[PDB]
Amino acid sequence: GYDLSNSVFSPDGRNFQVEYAVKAVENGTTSIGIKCNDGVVFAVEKLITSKLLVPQKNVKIQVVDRHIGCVYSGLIPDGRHLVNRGREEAASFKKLYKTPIPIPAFADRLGQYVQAHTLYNSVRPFGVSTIFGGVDKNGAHLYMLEPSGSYWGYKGAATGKGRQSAKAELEKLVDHHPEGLSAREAVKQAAKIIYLAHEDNKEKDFELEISWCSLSETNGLHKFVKGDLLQEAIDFAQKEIN
Amino acid sequence: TVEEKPDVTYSDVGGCKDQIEKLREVVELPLLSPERFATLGIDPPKGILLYG
Amino acid sequence: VDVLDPALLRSGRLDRKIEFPLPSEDSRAQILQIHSRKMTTDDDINWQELARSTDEFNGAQLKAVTVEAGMIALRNGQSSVKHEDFVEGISEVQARKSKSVSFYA
Amino acid sequence: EYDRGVSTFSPEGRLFQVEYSLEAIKLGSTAIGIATKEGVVLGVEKRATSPLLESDSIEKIVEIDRHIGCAMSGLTADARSMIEHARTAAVTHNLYYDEDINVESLTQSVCDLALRFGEGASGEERLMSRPFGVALLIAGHDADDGYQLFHAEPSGTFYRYNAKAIGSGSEGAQAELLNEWHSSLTLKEAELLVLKILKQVMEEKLDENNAQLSCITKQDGFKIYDNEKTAELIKELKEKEAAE
Amino acid sequence: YDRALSIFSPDGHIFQVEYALEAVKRGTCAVGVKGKNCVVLGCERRSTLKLQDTRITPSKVSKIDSHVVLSFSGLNADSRILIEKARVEAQSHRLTLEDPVTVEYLTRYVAGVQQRYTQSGGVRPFGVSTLIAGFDPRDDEPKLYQTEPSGIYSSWSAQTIGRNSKTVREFLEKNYDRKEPPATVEECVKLTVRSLLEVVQTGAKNIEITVVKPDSDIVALSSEEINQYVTQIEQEK
Amino acid sequence: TNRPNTLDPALLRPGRIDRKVEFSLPDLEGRANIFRIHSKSMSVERGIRWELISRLCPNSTGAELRSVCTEAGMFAIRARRKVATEKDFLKAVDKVISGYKKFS
Amino acid sequence: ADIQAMCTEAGLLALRERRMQVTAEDFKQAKERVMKNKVEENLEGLYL
Amino acid sequence: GSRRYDSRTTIFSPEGRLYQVEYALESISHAGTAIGIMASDGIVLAAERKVTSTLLEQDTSTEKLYKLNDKIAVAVAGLTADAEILINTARIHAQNYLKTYNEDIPVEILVRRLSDIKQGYTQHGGLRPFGVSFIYAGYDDRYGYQLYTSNPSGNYTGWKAISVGANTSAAQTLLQMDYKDDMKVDDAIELALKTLSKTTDSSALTYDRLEFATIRKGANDGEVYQKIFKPQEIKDILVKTGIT
Amino acid sequence: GYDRHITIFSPEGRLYQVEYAFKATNQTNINSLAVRGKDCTVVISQKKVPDKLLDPTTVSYIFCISRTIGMVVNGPIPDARNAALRAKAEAAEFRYKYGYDMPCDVLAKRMANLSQIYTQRAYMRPLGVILTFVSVDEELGPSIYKTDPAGYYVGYKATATGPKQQEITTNLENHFKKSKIDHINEESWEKVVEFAITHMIDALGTEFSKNDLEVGVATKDKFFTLSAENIEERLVAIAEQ
Amino acid sequence: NNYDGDTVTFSPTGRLFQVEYALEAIKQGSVTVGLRSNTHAVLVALKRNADELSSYQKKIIKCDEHMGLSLAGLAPDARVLSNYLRQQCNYSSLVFNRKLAVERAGHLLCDKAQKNTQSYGGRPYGVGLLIIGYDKSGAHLLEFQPSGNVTELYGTAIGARSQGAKTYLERTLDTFIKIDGNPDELIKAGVEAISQSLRDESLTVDNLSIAIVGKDTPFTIYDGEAVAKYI
Structure with a gap:
């Protein structure tokens, strides 16, 4: 059998329940993370399911500390629980060691938490991937955390339905700039590959959200991209795909 | 085994059941008025499986 | 095929391994129309409208709506099947026919 | 299948163990409760199983407080837990506020208790693995809405009624009630009404060793009618059924 | 632990309560008949077996209070737990309220022990039903109650539980009147001997009789006393 | 068909079968009604409650209700009455339930 | 059925012994034989 | 999760009967014979081991006979492993009684306490009960010598002569014919050995596979000497009674 | 029934749940080679990164559990992290209560004991990672202790781990057969790195790069790792051997 | 049946089926339609009686004098959630001297449901809440699914025949948002909205239950003849 729980195991190395949980994330919203020189620029495809909706009033981007963007896909309640947990961890680090939590340190703690639920059958595994990064004292970093409890450094990452389109152009983005690119320019490139990853979601319509934490613009604080800058990104992406 | 229009009504059947009104819909409705089926372009039903 | 042993599934057993997903929103509308094409077809009905309200419906589920729309039409004593009837036909295949109150109202 | 869990659904969409509990009220002997605005009368079928039974110290009529009465039908082992909590609740309000508790407020408190099944659900202290199997007809009088009669489910839901019967004869009793209830029924015209409807669903002879009456009046409080008075009224039914 | 050993059934029941009642059916027969001046609990003993010393072997009737006796049918392991909790409770009533417990209070208390484990998970109910009988202080009214593992209790004029309870009960319909209990203590005692002599039989060896008379007078009638009563009934019949 | 799990798929395909219906075990009030037809034909008590016998029964088919009426007839003959009461039907339901539940 | 057997087994015993009479004592031996393999000790498995 | 691998181990059957207790009685029938005989001057406990070997040291073993207190020892018939827990519980309980009343524990009290533990395990926790049967030899002032058997359900029954474990039926039937109330400890020693020679668990009964213990009031001044x-x-x- | 779904014994007496743990550590396809020098212990391990969009610097499997004791992990990286966290916590604790840092031997034994407890519990899944602990202790010299998911560990002259580790064993066996001692007689730690790389190429047939290697060296009283620049010096130094 | 009886599992499709089952409580449940402008929020619920003797069940619960929630699924579940919001509203008053923002209170409610969906022996909460209120960012209308997810709209519906109500609101959408300072119009349009949720259930003044909260209006439930100002 070996698929009833998550501490059944198989000779095949599979754990089933966890692999199943990734399917929720793979049918989640498109979300990207671009490692830039000065920071990171996150962008997330926000589906517009109806005209009844209030635009830019529902977010999947919650800030952790004042300098860590976190944007996630899969089951929204479950991911909001994981981010809720990591707001406590950031507060705990700040209490004990009197510093805003470093991005590699933050990744370590979250990985432990997600590990715990795949080691016990009396609690349910998580089924979300979060993409989080920011600017700390060791530089800018970018991490994506799998619901398995695995993370790595990333020069680009993506998740959701339109991850195929995004990743393919992120390869080209690192081939445009093998010496890395500005956070400011990466706004317009984040727009472009959400638009191309909306060709996997072209039975649907979308709202473009972009958020950044970069030293150059926002001074190492995580803020949202809005107003004329946001509209410039939209206009950029529009002409490229035309 | 074969009979010929035996005298039984809904009065003599104890209760009215949903399964009786599904029989009415197969049997009576196309016999009485195959007209309405035709104008609609729905096929008239003539097949019923009774199980219980 | 996840149940089934993967030895039987390999190349030359079976070559191409082809998934059949549910119909999507737009696909639902095409499957509804052909069912409706069989009966009287009218400008009242919009198949897209019916496709957006149905959710997670395959041709077997979609077919039950269409036929069922034409029995309300039959009882009403209509000669042309109207849009509303299809809309009413959706809710009988669903989990409700319930207007009950006990503890789940 | 869908009841092996301690709180599980159900391809219908509503909890399964709760559903069985509602269909276990029917197992209990009939409890009728007729509310007028002149008082609320509660009648119950006690059940006699033997003439060796002592049935006059057995009743399904229970005092919650002076101004609130209750009649229980279903499995009455479950109602033992609920009646104790109800009595405590009523007392708590007069401890804390020196005031009489509303009939609605009391019912709601007993509904809160009724949801306590599951052994991993919610934040509350769980102390059941399965829902209660008993339904109550909490009658009462408050001065804010007059006389009130509530029907409390083992679900933890409640409806205000003007007349509700539960138990074995629930369906045949309630068939009559829909037509025969109106607001110009006085306390005594309600009282004879209880016995007429109870006679139809009575599986024995109608008598006072298998039926018990009780009122809840503002003026005299919760009074359980003695078997002498209960017997008298029963004989006065058989006269008026021969006046037809 | 909290994993259900009591769970609601689609029949509106719990399976284990139904099972519990069959466990009491297989138990030994206890009869209760109350006079106008006594309660009498006579019970079937399994003292037929040889090489047994009955002095040190548990009795089937245990006093919980000075004027409250308890008899039981079903498992003998389960029953002792109820008898111990009941006694502790009885002395608590004397501590905080004064006076010994009423019979009715003890009836409710044993019922509440059964009740708790019926509703909660991780626990099964007991398979034991009791006949709790006695007097209240400054009362000459005999009290005869029956509690059952369901968590329900009922008063009775006469009652019988255990094996062939239907047979004894049927006998009591003609040999006991609701209107008229046995007038004397002795006729009540001989009626309980007479009921036991149906199923139990086999001398006064397996027949026990405990009489409680008003306000804490408990006497147990030895086999010799019972033998005399048996012989009189036999001869008369 | 008793069980529709004993019928061939060639037969099951459309045109042969255009409606499918499961017959339901009749409700308690619905048994009062099935009983009523048999009881009107039988010389019985006037003012009988049909609904009293149906309360006492659990879900039983209409064929059972037909047998119960014959059965009550028998017990009525034994006492030397040819006019039955609610009483002969209390008996009749007890016989059937204990009898059939155990086996078939 | 088993009453029928016990009565016959009791003639067999008394014929064995060569004694015309059939005792009460005799009958007990016949009860023993019929009941023999009906034994149940899970009766006091539940009760004790 | 947790409920997945549980099968509801301790529950009634439709007969009313506890699965684990029924199973437990089978495993005590595996374990060797232990016999107790109550004389009018002592109690003889005699047990034949369930293990014997020429490499097994049986000359320091006391694997069936264990003293709970100075006047109460047990013989064991069942799982030795399971029994060990109850044996040290008994020692604690007897010493506790001595601490609080400064009086030696009666035999009735000690047996009842152990019995409650066995019942408790099937009542709650899902625990297996102890699959052992003990024969308690004990002296007390009030009832004199008392003999008791306990079963794995958690119930105790008095006796004059009794056998548990293997060959309970065979041992019992021999005891019924031979037992008398005029027997002394001397006579009871001879009876015990003869019964074990007819209920032997192999094809030989030997001294080295025999554990034997008495409690005799033949010690001076009415004192009791456990030997x-x-x-x-x-x-x-063995040569005295002519087994060899 | 559940004799393969939880950690209870089977009629075979063999725990199938435990066996499955060892059948998941070789599915990450990372090989390791660990050799004891005359003054050092060197461990090199694979670091195959096949993506442009994964940062290779952060892809690692050598975690420093003490300042003197490295740990190299063969098997899944969630379980690696948990075992690293636990090991670090214990090593710190040992300093705190015994007044000196935890030995390699005892740190191995402590994780070994926790692994047994995780296969004692029937709702707890063991951490499916093979942990190699390299150090130079002052009371045990250059040391390797390798713990496994069951809770078994032993010391080693040299050891390898991974699917292709049998090939590595052949090289090591010849080396210590000829030398006739339990370590490499080489007094420069850099040249023990060079040797290790040579036998990795011999065993697996694979030509390595600096971004396919990751090197950890425990010298006396310190643990460091080589960066890819330093590993490139070693790869150039193979040509100079 | 291995993922449909347990709450602690996945589910080869990445689901939990217990949550889908909990969403069928909404289908079979009663209907409520909410619509807001920017200055007023409105909940119009269709009450349903059991029978003539029976009362009608209030489907709107007053949670605060600026907040209210309405049920459309499991009634016992609503009594857990209603108390929890009140507790947190008083916490906001105590600690921050502040009304509890509607946006914040949705996120708290979300995670409260989540941790019982994680735990074994737990349940998803089958009640669907529509939660209105008036805070410092204007009118808000939240829809609470059995999932726990909160979404913000200018008009929504949950319950039986929600689709007809949403069609009505999508047409009149830019009318009602640009009517402000006139609660009456919004209320009348909500009666008409829930007239598309009928299927010969009719509308009377003992089936109609309206509640609003405004800028200058507290949470107030209109019923009886106070809904006969709109019928």
Whole structure:
């Protein structure tokens, strides 16, 4: 059998329940993370399911500390629980060691938490991937955390339905700039590959959200991209795909 | 085994059941008025499986 | 095929391994129309409208709506099947026919 | 299948163990409760199983407080837990506020208790693995809405009624009630009404060793009618059924 | 632990309560008949077996209070737990309220022990039903109650539980009147001997009789006393 | 068909079968009604409650209700009455339930 | 059925012994034989 | 999760009967014979081991005979492993009684306490009960010598002569014919050995596979001396009674 | 029934749940080679990164559990992290209560004991990672202790781990057969790195790069790792051997 | 049946089926339609009686004098959630001297449901809440699914025949948002909205239950003849 729980195991190395949980994330919203020189620029495809909706009033981007963007896909309640947990961890680090939590340190703690639920059958595994990064004292970093409890450094990452389109152009983005690119320019490139990853979601319509934490613009604080800058990104992406 | 229009009504059947009104819909409705089926372009039903 | 042993599934057993997903929103509308094409077809009905309200419906589920729309039409004593009837036909295949109150109202 | 869990659904969409509990009220002997605005009368079928039974110290009529009465039908082992909590609740309000508790407020408190099944659900202290199997007809009088009669489910839901019967004869009793209830029924015209409807669903002879009456009046409080008075009224039914 | 050993059934029941009642059916027969001046609990003993010393072997009737006796049918392991909790409770009533417990209070208390484990998970109910009988202080009214593992209790004029309870009960319909209990203590005692002599039989060896008379007078009638009563009934019949 | 799990798929395909219906075990009030037809034909008590016998029964088919009426007839003959009461039907339901539940 | 057997087994015993009479004592031996393999000790498995 | 791998181990059957207790009685029938005989001057406990070997040291073993307190020892018939827990519980309980009343524990009290633990395990926790049967030899002032058997359900029954474990039926039937109330400890020693020679668990009964212990009031001043006989003191008595 | 779904014994007496743990550590396809020098212990391990969009610097499997004791992990990286966290916590604790840092031997034994407890519990899944602990202790010299998911560990002259580790064993066996001692007689730690790389190429047939290697060296009283620049010096130094 | 009886599992499709089952409580449940402008929020619920003797069940619960929630699924579940919001509203008053923002209170409610969906022996909460209120960012209308997810709209519906109500609101959408300072119009349009949720259930003044909260209006439930100002 070996698929009833998550501490059944198989000779095949599979754990089933966890692999199943990734399917929720793979049918989640498109979300990207671009490692830039000065920071990171996150962008997330926000589906517009109806005209009844209030635009830019529902977010999947919650800030952790004042300098860590976190944007996630899969089951929204479950991911909001994981981010809720990591707001406590950031507060705990700040209490004990009197510093805003470093991005590699933050990744370590979250990985432990997600590990715990795949080691016990009396609690349910998580089924979300979060993409989080920011600017700390060791530089800018970018991490994506799998619901398995695995993370790595990333020069680009993506998740959701339109991850195929995004990743393919992120390869080209690192081939445009093998010496890395500005956070400011990466706004317009984040727009472009959400638009191309909306060709996997072209039975649907979308709202473009972009958020950044970069030293150059926002001074190492995580803020949202809005107003004329946001509209410039939209206009950029529009002409490229035309 | 074969009979010929035996005298039984809904009065003599104890209760009215949903399964009786599904029989009415197969049997009576196309016999009485195959007209309405035709104008609609729905096929008239003539097949019923009774199980219980 | 996840149940089934993967030895039987390999190349030359079976070559191409082809998934059949549910119909999507737009696909639902095409499957509804052909069912409706069989009966009287009218400008009242919009198949897209019916496709957006149905959710997670395959041709077997979609077919039950269409036929069922034409029995309300039959009882009403209509000669042309109207849009509303299809809309009413959706809710009988669903989990409700319930207007009950006990503890789940 | 869908009841092996301690709180599980159900391809219908509503909890399964709760559903069985509602269909276990029917197992209990009939409890009728007729509310007028002149008082609320509660009648119950006690059940006699033997003439060796002592049935006059057995009743399904229970005092919650002076101004609130209750009649229980279903499995009455479950109602033992609920009646104790109800009595405590009523007392708590007069401890804390020196005031009489509303009939609605009391019912709601007993509904809160009724949801306590599951052994991993919610934040509350769980102390059941399965829902209660008993339904109550909490009658009462408050001065804010007059006389009130509530029907409390083992679900933890409640409806205000003007007349509700539960138990074995629930369906045949309630068939009559829909037509025969109106607001110009006085306390005594309600009282004879209880016995007429109870006679139809009575599986024995109608008598006072298998039926018990009780009122809840503002003026005299919760009074359980003695078997002498209960017997008298029963004989006065058989006269008026021969006046037809 | 909290994993259900009591769970609601689609029949509106719990399976284990139904099972519990069959466990009491297989138990030994206890009869209760109350006079106008006594309660009498006579019970079937399994003292037929040889090489047994009955002095040190548990009795089937245990006093919980000075004027409250308890008899039981079903498992003998389960029953002792109820008898111990009941006694502790009885002395608590004397501590905080004064006076010994009423019979009715003890009836409710044993019922509440059964009740708790019926509703909660991780626990099964007991398979034991009791006949709790006695007097209240400054009362000459005999009290005869029956509690059952369901968590329900009922008063009775006469009652019988255990094996062939239907047979004894049927006998009591003609040999006991609701209107008229046995007038004397002795006729009540001989009626309980007479009921036991149906199923139990086999001398006064397996027949026990405990009489409680008003306000804490408990006497147990030895086999010799019972033998005399048996012989009189036999001869008369 | 008793069980529709004993019928061939060639037969099951459309045109042969255009409606499918499961017959339901009749409700308690619905048994009062099935009983009523048999009881009107039988010389019985006037003012009988049909609904009293149906309360006492659990879900039983209409064929059972037909047998119960014959059965009550028998017990009525034994006492030397040819006019039955609610009483002969209390008996009749007890016989059937204990009898059939155990086996078939 | 088993009453029928016990009565016959009791003639067999008394014929064995060569004694015309059939005792009460005799009958007990016949009860023993019929009941023999009906034994149940899970009766006091539940009760004790 | 947790409920997945549980099968509801301790529950009634439709007969009313506890699965684990029924199973437990089977495993005590595996374990060797232990016999207790109550004389009018003592109690003889005699047990045949369920293990014997020429490499097994049985000359320091006291694997069936264990003293709970100075006047109460047990013989064991069942799982030795399971029994060990109850044996040290008994020692604690007897010492606790001595601490609080400064009086030696009666035999009735000690047996009842152990019995409650066994019942408790099937009542709650899902725990297996202890699959052992003990024969308690005990002296007390009030009832004199008292003999008791306990079963794995958690119930105790008095006796004059009794056997548990293997060959309970065979041992019992021999005891019924031979037992008398005029027997002394001397007579009871001879009876016990003869019964074990007819209920032997192989094809031989030997001193080295015999554990033997008495409790005798033949110690001076009415005092009771528990003597657990060594296998070579058993050997002396083996030639005395003419087994060899 | 559940004799393969939880950690209870089977009629075979063999725990199938435990066996499955060892059948998941070789599915990450990372090989390791660990050799004891005359003054050092060197461990090199694979670091195959096949993506442009994964940062290779952060892809690692050598975690420093003490300042003197490295740990190299063969098997899944969630379980690696948990075992690293636990090991670090214990090593710190040992300093705190015994007044000196935890030995390699005892740190191995402590994780070994926790692994047994995780296969004692029937709702707890063991951490499916093979942990190699390299150090130079002052009371045990250059040391390797390798713990496994069951809770078994032993010391080693040299050891390898991974699917292709049998090939590595052949090289090591010849080396210590000829030398006739339990370590490499080389007094420069850099040249023990060079040797290790040579036998990795011999065993697996694979030509390595600096971004396919990751090197950890425990010298006396310190643990460091080589960066890819330093590993490139070693790869150039193979040509100079 | 291995993922449909347990709450602690996945589910080869990445689901939990217990949550889908909990969403069928909404289908079979009663209907409520909410619509807001920017200055007023409105909940119009269709009450349903059991029978003539029976009362009608209030489907709107007053949670605060600026907040209210309405049920459309499991009634016992609503009594857990209603108390929890009140507790947190008083916490906001105590600690921050502040009304509890509607946006914040949705996120708290979300995670409260989540941790019982994680735990074994737990349940998803089958009640669907529509939660209105008036805070410092204007009118808000939240829809609470059995999932726990909160979404913000200018008009929504949950319950039986929600689709007809949403069609009505999508047409009149830019009318009602640009009517402000006139609660009456919004209320009348909500009666008409829930007239598309009928299927010969009719509308009377003992089936109609309206509640609003405004800028200058507290949470107030209109019923009886106070809904006969709109019928």
